[PDB]
Amino acid sequence: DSLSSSLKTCYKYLNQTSRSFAAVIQALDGEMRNAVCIFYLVLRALDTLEDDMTISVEKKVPLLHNFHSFLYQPDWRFMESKEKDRQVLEDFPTISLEFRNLAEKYQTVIADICRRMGIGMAEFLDKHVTSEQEWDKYCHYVAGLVGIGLSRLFSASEFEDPLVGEDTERANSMGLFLQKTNIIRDYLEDQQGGREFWPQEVWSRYVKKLGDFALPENIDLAVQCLNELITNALHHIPDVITYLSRLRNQSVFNFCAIPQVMAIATLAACYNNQQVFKGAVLIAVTLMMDATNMPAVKAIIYQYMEEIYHRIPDSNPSSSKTRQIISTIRTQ
Amino acid sequence: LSSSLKTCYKYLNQTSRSFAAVIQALDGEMRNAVCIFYLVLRALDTLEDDMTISVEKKVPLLHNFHSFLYQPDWRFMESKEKDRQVLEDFPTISLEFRNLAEKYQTVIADICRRMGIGMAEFLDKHVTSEQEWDKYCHYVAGLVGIGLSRLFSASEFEDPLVGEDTERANSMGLFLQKTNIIRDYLEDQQGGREFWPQEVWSRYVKKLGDFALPENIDLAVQCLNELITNALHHIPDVITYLSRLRNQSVFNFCAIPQVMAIATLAACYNNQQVFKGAVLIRAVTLMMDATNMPAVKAIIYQYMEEIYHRIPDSNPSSSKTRQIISTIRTQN
Amino acid sequence: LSSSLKTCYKYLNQTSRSFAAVIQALDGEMRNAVCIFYLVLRALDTLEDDMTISVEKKVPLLHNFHSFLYQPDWRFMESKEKDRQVLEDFPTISLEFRNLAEKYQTVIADICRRMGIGMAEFLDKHVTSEQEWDKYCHYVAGLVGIGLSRLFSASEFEDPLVGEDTERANSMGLFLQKTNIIRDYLEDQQGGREFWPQEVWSRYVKKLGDFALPENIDLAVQCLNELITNALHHIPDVITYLSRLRNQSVFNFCAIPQVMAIATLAACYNNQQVFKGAVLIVTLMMDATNMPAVKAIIYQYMEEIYHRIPDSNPSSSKTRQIISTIRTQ
Amino acid sequence: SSSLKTCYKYLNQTSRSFAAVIQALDGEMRNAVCIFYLVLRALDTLEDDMTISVEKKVPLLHNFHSFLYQPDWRFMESKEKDRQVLEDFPTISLEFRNLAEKYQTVIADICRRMGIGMAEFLDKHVTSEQEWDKYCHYVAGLVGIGLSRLFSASEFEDPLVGEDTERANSMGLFLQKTNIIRDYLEDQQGGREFWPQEVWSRYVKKLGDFALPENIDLAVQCLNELITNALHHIPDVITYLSRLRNQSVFNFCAIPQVMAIATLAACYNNQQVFKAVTLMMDATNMPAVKAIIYQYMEEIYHRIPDSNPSSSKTRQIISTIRTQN
Amino acid sequence: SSSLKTCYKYLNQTSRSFAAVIQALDGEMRNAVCIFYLVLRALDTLEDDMTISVEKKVPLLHNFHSFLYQPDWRFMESKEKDRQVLEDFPTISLEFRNLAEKYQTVIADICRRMGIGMAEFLDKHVTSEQEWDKYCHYVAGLVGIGLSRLFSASEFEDPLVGEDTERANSMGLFLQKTNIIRDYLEDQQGGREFWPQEVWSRYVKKLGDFALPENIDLAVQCLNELITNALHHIPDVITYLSRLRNQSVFNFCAIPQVMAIATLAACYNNQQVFKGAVLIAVTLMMDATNMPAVKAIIYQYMEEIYHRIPDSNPSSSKTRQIISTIRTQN
Amino acid sequence: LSSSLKTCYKYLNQTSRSFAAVIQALDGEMRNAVCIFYLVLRALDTLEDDMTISVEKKVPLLHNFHSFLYQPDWRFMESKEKDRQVLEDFPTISLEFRNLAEKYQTVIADICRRMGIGMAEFLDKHVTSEQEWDKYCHYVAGLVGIGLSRLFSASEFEDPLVGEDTERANSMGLFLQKTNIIRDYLEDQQGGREFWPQEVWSRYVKKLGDFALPENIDLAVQCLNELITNALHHIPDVITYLSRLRNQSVFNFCAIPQVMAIATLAACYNNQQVFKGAVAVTLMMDATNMPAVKAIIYQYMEEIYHRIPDSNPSSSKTRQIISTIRTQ
Numbered sequence A: 001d002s003l004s005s006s007l008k009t010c011y012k013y014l015n016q017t018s019r020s021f022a023a024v025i026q027a028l029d030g031e032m033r034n035a036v037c038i039f040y041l042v043l044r045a046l047d048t049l050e051d052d053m054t055i056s057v058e059k060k061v062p063l064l065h066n067f068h069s070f071l072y073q074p075d076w077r078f079m080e081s082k083e084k085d086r087q088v089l090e091d092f093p094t095i096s097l098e099f100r101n102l103a104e105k106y107q108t109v110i111a112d113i114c115r116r117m118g119i120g121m122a123e124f125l126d127k128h129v130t131s132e133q134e135w136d137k138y139c140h141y142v143a144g145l146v147g148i149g150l151s152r153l154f155s156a157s158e159f160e161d162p163l164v165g166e167d168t169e170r171a172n173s174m175g176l177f178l179q180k181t182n183i184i185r186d187y188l189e190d191q192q193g194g195r196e197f198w199p200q201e202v203w204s205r206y207v208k209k210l211g212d213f214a215l216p217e218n219i220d221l222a223v224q225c226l227n228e229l230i231t232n233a234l235h236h237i238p239d240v241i242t243y244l245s246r247l248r249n250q251s252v253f254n255f256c257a258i259p260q261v262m263a264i265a266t267l268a269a270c271y272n273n274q275q276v277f278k279g280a281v282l283i284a285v286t287l288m289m290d291a292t293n294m295p296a297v298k299a300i301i302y303q304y305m306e307e308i309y310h311r312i313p314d315s316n317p318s319s320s321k322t323r324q325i326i327s328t329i330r331t332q
Numbered sequence B: 001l002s003s004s005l006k007t008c009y010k011y012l013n014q015t016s017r018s019f020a021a022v023i024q025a026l027d028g029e030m031r032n033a034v035c036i037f038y039l040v041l042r043a044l045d046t047l048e049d050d051m052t053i054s055v056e057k058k059v060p061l062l063h064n065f066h067s068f069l070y071q072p073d074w075r076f077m078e079s080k081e082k083d084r085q086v087l088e089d090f091p092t093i094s095l096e097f098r099n100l101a102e103k104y105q106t107v108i109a110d111i112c113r114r115m116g117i118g119m120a121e122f123l124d125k126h127v128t129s130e131q132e133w134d135k136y137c138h139y140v141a142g143l144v145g146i147g148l149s150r151l152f153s154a155s156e157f158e159d160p161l162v163g164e165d166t167e168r169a170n171s172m173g174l175f176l177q178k179t180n181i182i183r184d185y186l187e188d189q190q191g192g193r194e195f196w197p198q199e200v201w202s203r204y205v206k207k208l209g210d211f212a213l214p215e216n217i218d219l220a221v222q223c224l225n226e227l228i229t230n231a232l233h234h235i236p237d238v239i240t241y242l243s244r245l246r247n248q249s250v251f252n253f254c255a256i257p258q259v260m261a262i263a264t265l266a267a268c269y270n271n272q273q274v275f276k277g278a279v280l281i282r283a284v285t286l287m288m289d290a291t292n293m294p295a296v297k298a299i300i301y302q303y304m305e306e307i308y309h310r311i312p313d314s315n316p317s318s319s320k321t322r323q324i325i326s327t328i329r330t331q332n
Numbered sequence C: 001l002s003s004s005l006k007t008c009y010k011y012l013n014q015t016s017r018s019f020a021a022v023i024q025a026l027d028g029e030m031r032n033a034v035c036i037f038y039l040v041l042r043a044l045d046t047l048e049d050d051m052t053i054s055v056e057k058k059v060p061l062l063h064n065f066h067s068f069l070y071q072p073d074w075r076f077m078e079s080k081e082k083d084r085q086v087l088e089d090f091p092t093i094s095l096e097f098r099n100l101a102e103k104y105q106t107v108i109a110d111i112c113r114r115m116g117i118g119m120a121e122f123l124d125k126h127v128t129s130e131q132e133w134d135k136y137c138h139y140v141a142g143l144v145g146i147g148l149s150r151l152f153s154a155s156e157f158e159d160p161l162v163g164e165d166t167e168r169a170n171s172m173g174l175f176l177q178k179t180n181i182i183r184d185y186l187e188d189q190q191g192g193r194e195f196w197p198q199e200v201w202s203r204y205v206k207k208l209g210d211f212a213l214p215e216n217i218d219l220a221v222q223c224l225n226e227l228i229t230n231a232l233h234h235i236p237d238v239i240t241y242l243s244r245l246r247n248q249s250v251f252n253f254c255a256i257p258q259v260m261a262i263a264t265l266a267a268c269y270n271n272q273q274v275f276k277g278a279v280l281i282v283t284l285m286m287d288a289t290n291m292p293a294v295k296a297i298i299y300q301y302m303e304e305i306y307h308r309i310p311d312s313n314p315s316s317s318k319t320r321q322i323i324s325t326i327r328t329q
Numbered sequence D: 001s002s003s004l005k006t007c008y009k010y011l012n013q014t015s016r017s018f019a020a021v022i023q024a025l026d027g028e029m030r031n032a033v034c035i036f037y038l039v040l041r042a043l044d045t046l047e048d049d050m051t052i053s054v055e056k057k058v059p060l061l062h063n064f065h066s067f068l069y070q071p072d073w074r075f076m077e078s079k080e081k082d083r084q085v086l087e088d089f090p091t092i093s094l095e096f097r098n099l100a101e102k103y104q105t106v107i108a109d110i111c112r113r114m115g116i117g118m119a120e121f122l123d124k125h126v127t128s129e130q131e132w133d134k135y136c137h138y139v140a141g142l143v144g145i146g147l148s149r150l151f152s153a154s155e156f157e158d159p160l161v162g163e164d165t166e167r168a169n170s171m172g173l174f175l176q177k178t179n180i181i182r183d184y185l186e187d188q189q190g191g192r193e194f195w196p197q198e199v200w201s202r203y204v205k206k207l208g209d210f211a212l213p214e215n216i217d218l219a220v221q222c223l224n225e226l227i228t229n230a231l232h233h234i235p236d237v238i239t240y241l242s243r244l245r246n247q248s249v250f251n252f253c254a255i256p257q258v259m260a261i262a263t264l265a266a267c268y269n270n271q272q273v274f275k276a277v278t279l280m281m282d283a284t285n286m287p288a289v290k291a292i293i294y295q296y297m298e299e300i301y302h303r304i305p306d307s308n309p310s311s312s313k314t315r316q317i318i319s320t321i322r323t324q325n
Numbered sequence E: 001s002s003s004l005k006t007c008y009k010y011l012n013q014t015s016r017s018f019a020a021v022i023q024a025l026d027g028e029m030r031n032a033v034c035i036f037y038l039v040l041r042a043l044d045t046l047e048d049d050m051t052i053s054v055e056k057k058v059p060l061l062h063n064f065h066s067f068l069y070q071p072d073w074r075f076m077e078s079k080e081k082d083r084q085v086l087e088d089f090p091t092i093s094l095e096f097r098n099l100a101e102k103y104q105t106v107i108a109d110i111c112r113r114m115g116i117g118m119a120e121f122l123d124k125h126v127t128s129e130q131e132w133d134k135y136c137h138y139v140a141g142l143v144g145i146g147l148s149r150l151f152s153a154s155e156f157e158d159p160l161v162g163e164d165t166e167r168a169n170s171m172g173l174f175l176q177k178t179n180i181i182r183d184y185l186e187d188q189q190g191g192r193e194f195w196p197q198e199v200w201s202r203y204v205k206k207l208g209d210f211a212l213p214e215n216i217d218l219a220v221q222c223l224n225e226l227i228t229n230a231l232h233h234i235p236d237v238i239t240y241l242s243r244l245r246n247q248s249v250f251n252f253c254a255i256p257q258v259m260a261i262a263t264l265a266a267c268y269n270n271q272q273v274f275k276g277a278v279l280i281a282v283t284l285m286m287d288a289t290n291m292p293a294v295k296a297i298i299y300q301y302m303e304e305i306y307h308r309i310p311d312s313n314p315s316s317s318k319t320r321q322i323i324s325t326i327r328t329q330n
Numbered sequence F: 001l002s003s004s005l006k007t008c009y010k011y012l013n014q015t016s017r018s019f020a021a022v023i024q025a026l027d028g029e030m031r032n033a034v035c036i037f038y039l040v041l042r043a044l045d046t047l048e049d050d051m052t053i054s055v056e057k058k059v060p061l062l063h064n065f066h067s068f069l070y071q072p073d074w075r076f077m078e079s080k081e082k083d084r085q086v087l088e089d090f091p092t093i094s095l096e097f098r099n100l101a102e103k104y105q106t107v108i109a110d111i112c113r114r115m116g117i118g119m120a121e122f123l124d125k126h127v128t129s130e131q132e133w134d135k136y137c138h139y140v141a142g143l144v145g146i147g148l149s150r151l152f153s154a155s156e157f158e159d160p161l162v163g164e165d166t167e168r169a170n171s172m173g174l175f176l177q178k179t180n181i182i183r184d185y186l187e188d189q190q191g192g193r194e195f196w197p198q199e200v201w202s203r204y205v206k207k208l209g210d211f212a213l214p215e216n217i218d219l220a221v222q223c224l225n226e227l228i229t230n231a232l233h234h235i236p237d238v239i240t241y242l243s244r245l246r247n248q249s250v251f252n253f254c255a256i257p258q259v260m261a262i263a264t265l266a267a268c269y270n271n272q273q274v275f276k277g278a279v280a281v282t283l284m285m286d287a288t289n290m291p292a293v294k295a296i297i298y299q300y301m302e303e304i305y306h307r308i309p310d311s312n313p314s315s316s317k318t319r320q321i322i323s324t325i326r327t328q
């Protein structure tokens, strides 16, 4: 009871802002627990700055660029946000304090990722995503680097093999899969917010304005685009399996696998589904197993791949591509 | 990689609803070996099941099926069944069969050979005694359990004992087969197929189809309970078999189907719904899945109690049902 | 196998809806030893429950129960309780008890002896203070956690450190017992039994039975939340105790009931239904058979409670504090 | 950081017996134990500097724990060999403040309590055997306790390890009593007396009389009585070591204990103090450590002269250690 | 327990190479093995006492196992060094009876069968190599068998350990043969002969001749032949050790075996064996507490012997043969 | 047992004094696989070493050695080396090789091939740069560590992760190789070959053979310390690699040699004997568990550190790498 009330506040913020990762983060072994919790909170504060449209580009860029350094400015905080999670910015001193209490080896990793992410975020403030190549670049900045950072923390803690943090491509794929999935799922919500994440070079081959997919008379063209993007995302699954297969720590495995499975289940539920453009989407041998051991995770993944495979319209324009990537996933 | 192997996995996912995923999740060489084993048995079953194939043509097909595995160009183009693709493109499947290590080939062909003979033996007859019921189930399921066990031991992912104890392996197949036969009474009766042992049901009604008559519901349920009680006798062997597995991917593959079958019997016990369509596959279970032996034991024991709780003193098999469950409870 | 052993397992399933399966799933010798431990405790509990047994007749039965384990012909035929069969056919159970290895016998007899003293002590009084609550729960459940832990170590399936940690083993039992006491308010009130601590409920109403009256539902829910908050304080010990276990069958046996109790408090928290009857119960992509998963499940249930805490509730700050402590460390 | 590198440089320059096993500890325990050692090294250096007046030393020992939080604190007036850890204390304190809070609380608490005890024995010598235990508690028992709390706080060892302070105390006492008994001569030729007065007085008038040849006979008897006292801690030592589950921690704890026991077996009834199966097993697993311990107990037992005033007691404590389990 | 405390005093009093690893055994094995050792010590002390007439000795050996259940039994007429365990046998037997029946059963059965064998060799010397194995079985092989049965009975080790009496017998024979080889001179000077006559008679007329300087070269050749014979038990020793799972049991078993192997390597082609006592580098970095380390140590000692084999030695081929088998057996 | 397998182990013991014992102590299938691996590599090395074979003849023998494993009758009767028995009786060895499971044969052949190629590359040239020194060491040692790591995983006694780490497995080999090279300076000098990197020694004396002359002893020990400082940089990889192992037999096999090498570098550091002939807590624990191996390593690092002359041209470097190892 004597210990850090500032750390208790950090865990309060974690549960306040994260519905999908708080439980598995708090379940991580030893040192990984606080390091990952803090990593999530600083990223949350950085993301809130990027998302706040009341902050002009001119004022925002320097904040994004120096955020990694604010981690070492004890009294720094930001009181001008109107975003829902602004509490992490207004009470950033409590968070940076605990960040500075982490072992240096973890601080180095977190700061490096924050620095790089800030640079990438600034880069995209005055431009939308065009090519699929730019889509990967953007996803790398806001998610790929997170997978890389998390992996570096795992190896640094010694709970996982040095290889985990070294193979940045596989770590990058973990983040990209989760990011592309959410982006595909949150089309309608993002569109109603003025933000666009779907690659221009893809939706433009369907409609004149991305926002057109929101209108009923374009539902067909929309779903087709939806399926092309989902097909794109599926290409990360082989890396995801490789990455998970290298994990040896149960708490880390649960942390990494559960979110990936939920993401795969989301793509399966969105595939060739019109509800993606009308609102939010929602949820048998798999119901017998959880995503806590590799063979079960593989089984769960394959079930979802077949669920998508048998719904692939010969009609749809991505049919051949979708079947091909699923076959690649199946034949190991 | 291989175009033919990718094709095999495509056929596996297209034909197997409940085994495709756990199969694809199997470690190393077991994966292709079991995938191919499933496909060849699927082709064999498709031939036996095709009523447009005369007995004159069918007996030779069933007896020699195993040898077609060795003939590069063999295929069957006269099937009128839904899964005929595996027969018409058998060369692709047999090619992969011949690519498997010789030790796996020995197992698969031996089983196909013995299964073919057995199926041929039953083309002209229905099941009479309970002994004949066991014989039939051995031919179409027990031998499969035996084959799988031999593949596991041959691959060395499991100890030699798994493949050597054919009676325990046979019990695994019999339990699944009997459970399916009991559950599918109505669907089969409407398909002109009879699998319930005649020496058992003849003690209740004159025609097996009479159980579908509302005025015979009481006798039908009594018979149902007698057959379920019969199947419960395989449980001790199932627990023994599963308790011997050391490979997680193999455990998942074997344990899940057994748990689903047990859940099914529990849902069917003393349930009139069995004779009015498919049944409702209905505590301390909720918090645990079937991926570790102790949990599997607990789930199995819980289902035995669901049955025990419903045993009416007036049922003709009540004492026998209590007796076998009591044996399952007490055995360590 | 043995005729008498078959009978014991028959009795286990007759008197246990939530433990029989995980007990039967225990490895080697723990199976029979835990089955027998359950049965003798069921018998002791039935004697304590029977209101048709005068207190002066009951005190010796409770004090001497442990010695009856060594009396081949001892049985009790004057009970009218629902589980009386274990008392009327106690010779069958004591026989199997005497068939257990001596190391298990010693632990079981010792716990029965100590529990008997505690139950006898509370026959003429109700739980007053929260400290008294902990004491009564120690007698009927804490000692059981301690006994079970010693059985685990005795069997060698668990490290000696498991049985040695009597403090946290005690917390494992207290948590399950308090949870049941909280949930079973109405059931016990209509049975003439009172388990809610008087120093706590008297700050709300004049009679514990008053919580049954619809016009006190508000006060009732406040006391409910205060008791739940008290119970939550054992979770840190539970997590520490579970984290030490290395045998899968033992882990399932201990972890599942704790998670089920946690799920129960979450469902009962700030729930008016507790006073009108029974209350029924990431989290789905993981079950409770590995420690990290059990932690995640517990944390999800804690947020379930945290998010529903009313500012007006008199225990609100205390409730947040303990959940915060659980989350943070 | 260079500051953490400097800390390990000091660790190696100051510790002959623990530097290696400390650096071999798993994860978090490594830096926490390294820092704990350095701060204790700095405190002991202050405690031993005779050029520091009492009125100046007492408050320093009492307030040492507080310097851990003062970024700029350092001591520039020491003439001791390891004065570098005092002159560059800011480097050590910086790394202490970088440790997780749970380790900081333990280290600070122990330093505060040891400083109190050290100041208490500046103006006096050890008289009774009870005072001897009190003195050893302050300079060593508390160290075992501190270390145990760190092991438990790191989660590498069971909660019980840090909670059982008596067993932890015994670990420290056994090491300290062994070094005190062994270093008799060196201490006398240094102006310090650590052997309990109520013990040596029963053999001579002045503790320094043991050095003179004409008293060697009485010196060895006193020597054997003290060793017999020390042996009483072995049961707790076995109990403590038996609870360890982390190999790096076991090595760290077991090796020094065995070396200490080997030392008492060498000093038993040996005049130089005042002037089998073993070779096939090392101290890296509990059963081996036990075997080794029993071996040394017999080397001592087989050498208990019936004429020695403590003969009976010595035999009794060895007997208790043998029949334990 | 004052009586149990006395038993451990005797153990340390009589055992120099086993008391430490015995006292380090986990749980119930500790007292069971301690008692087992004390009873055998007493039995061996009687068999050794030459002041006891044969007609008076045979009964003692044959009925020794029964004295375990005779609370007051004891022997006051022994003049041997370890007579304390006999004079105060009541203390020892008391603790024996405090042991779990399953342990008592094993111990008494071994004492019985051992007593039979000892009595049998009271009037004869060891002739054939077959009889040497027989003799060693009676005084050591059965001990390995009894100990293994105690391990399995305690459940600290699998049932196989106590079941494979062959491997267990081999464990005992290797230790006994090594000690018989090493203690030639001491035994000879003590008036006892343990070397097999069919082996030594091929070199000299009397076993005692090996104690004469003039026969030193023949003595060494016989020595090498007997060592070559003992080496044949190594395969079984490795197999037996590789099946153990309890660390305290492993140390108890491995240390004495490694020490015996070290002893044979030191005695091989060594004249010192007939003049006095023989005192026992990748090995440097290893201790005998983990199977792979134990294997490595054994292999090193084998090459130590192999490298010293004389071309002209009458057993050279056999020695290289068994060593080669040990090197190759996986 | 097969007489051909017994013969192999006979040769193993004949040509190995520090590896035979730990090889024979390996679990299951690793035992014969590693034994055979050692034997073939010994043959290959013997060929390179033989100065009676012309470069025109040697090259082919090196480049194709990996193929001789599948040629039942292949052998070599023209060697003058001490271990020619392995070449002259290679058929006995290839036979057992072909008895190994395919997964082991693959690994072994691959390494032999890549090794032969690399070896032929230095038949005429000497070691120039340190970069080149690692290159040569990678060929005769580095690749061996990789092959071994792959056999551990192939056997499955070790996690797939072990074989995957080619970089640290390579460092394991380079560390042992540089140590033997540094130590055997004089023997290799009085033997004909030069392995010390030219770029390094040519900065102290004009002829590498000059270190053998008393009027250079000082310059000698200085170059010595500089090389040891180079080899020390591999220790962090060694510790990391060893820390991953889970099989006791494999750990003992890998750990003992690394520790023996470290002890060797500590004995040679700032030691003159290197240019003439040959050359507590630690004594309480052996190299069979990782924490003990760390402790032993650290004690040796201290033995070298407290002997670092602040005059030596490497003093700064030596302290820097040791500091890194200590705080790692």
Ligand SMILES: COCCCOc1ccc(C#C[C@@]2(O)CN3CCC2CC3)c(Cc2ccccc2)n1
Pocket: C019, C023, C034, C035, C037, C038, C041, C042, C043, C045, C140, C141, C142, C144, C145, C146, C148, C149, C169, C172, C173, C176, C254
């Ligand atoms: C490591 O400890 C984990 C904590 C488990 O804690 C507890 C605490 C109490 C009980 C209980 C009980 C009862 O005696 C009370 N009544 C309900 C069950 C039985 C018989 C009548 C039980 C149930 C129980 C009792 C005996 C054997 C198995 C389970 N568990």
Ligand SMILES: COCCCOc1ccc(C#C[C@@]2(O)CN3CCC2CC3)c(Cc2ccccc2)n1
Pocket: E018, E022, E033, E034, E036, E037, E040, E041, E044, E139, E140, E141, E143, E144, E145, E147, E148, E168, E171, E172, E175, E176, E253
């Ligand atoms: C598990 O098998 C491992 C092989 C151990 O084999 C053996 C064989 C013989 C003995 C012995 C003996 C003696 O009876 C003979 N003499 C010397 C020691 C004692 C008393 C007199 C001993 C010593 C012994 C006897 C009883 C208990 C423990 C050890 N060990």
